[PDB]
């Protein structure tokens with residue numbers, strides 16, 4: 760699709776059997792989701808932005824589906840104020856900025 | 859242009875006669891720049907990121923070039939980790955997401 764920026768670019772994702780809304784965030788290096796359960800190994804991480812840093816769990820190799828596009832990547836889980844899809848996954852669905 | 863997301867979408871902006879690097883950021887409602895001088899009066903604004911809230915100075919109707927594309931709009935100045943161009947100015951330059 761072509762996605763306008765008049766509004767926040769929110770999409771539906773399927774992850775871990777769950778349906779979730781997330782923001783397509785070209786300013787995020789990583790994908791960060793609100794608290795949720797994921798399978799497999801994780802390690803702690805600190806990620807930072809306006810207002811400072813938060814602690815997350817980093818899960819690698821997580822299957823995600825965004826707009827019918829299957830991808831696989833790292834998902835960070837923690838007390839983010841909003842679900843964000845970062846570049847790590849945006850690349851995998853072939854997403855670009857165009858002007 | 860068309861910008862892929864395998865790296866940070868950093869571009870050059872020009873504001874008040876100077877060049878800076880800024881991040882094209884679709885997850886951001888607003889454009890926030892690191893500490894700098896701007897003409898005229900400013901208003902207070904709180905903006906929230908991953909780490910919580912900062913106070914910034916809001917300047918209105920500020921001419922800014924983004925990738926040679928001319929825009930005039932609101933610029934926030936505050937303690938941001940990086941210069942970010944948010945959707946307020948991305949829409950002015952005709953930016954969309956595409957996949």
Ligand SMILES: C=CCNC(=O)[C@@H](NC(=O)[C@@](O)(CCCN(Cc1ccc(-c2ccccc2)cc1)NC(=O)[C@@H](NC(=O)OC)C(C)(C)C)Cc1ccc(CC=C)cc1)C(C)C
Nearest residue numbers: 786787788789806807808809840885886887906907908939
């Ligand atoms: C460890 C890797 C480096 N860190 C990052 O890449 C992180 N990225 C970000 O913080 C942003 O991409 C910002 C994410 C987008 N957020 C997503 C976001 C959206 C809403 C909220 C929110 C806050 C309070 C209440 C309700 C919602 C929080 C985060 N939006 C905002 O921050 C905007 N907020 C906004 O538009 O208000 C709606 C701002 C810029 C005006 C503050 C911008 C950004 C990119 C990169 C860096 C660091 C680069 C050296 C710092 C900031 C992380 C999310 C992956």
Ligand SMILES: [Cl-]
Nearest residue numbers: 831832833847
């Ligand atoms: Cl990844």
Ligand SMILES: [Cl-]
Nearest residue numbers: 850853862863
């Ligand atoms: Cl590509």
Ligand SMILES: [Cl-]
Nearest residue numbers: 931932946947
């Ligand atoms: Cl504006």
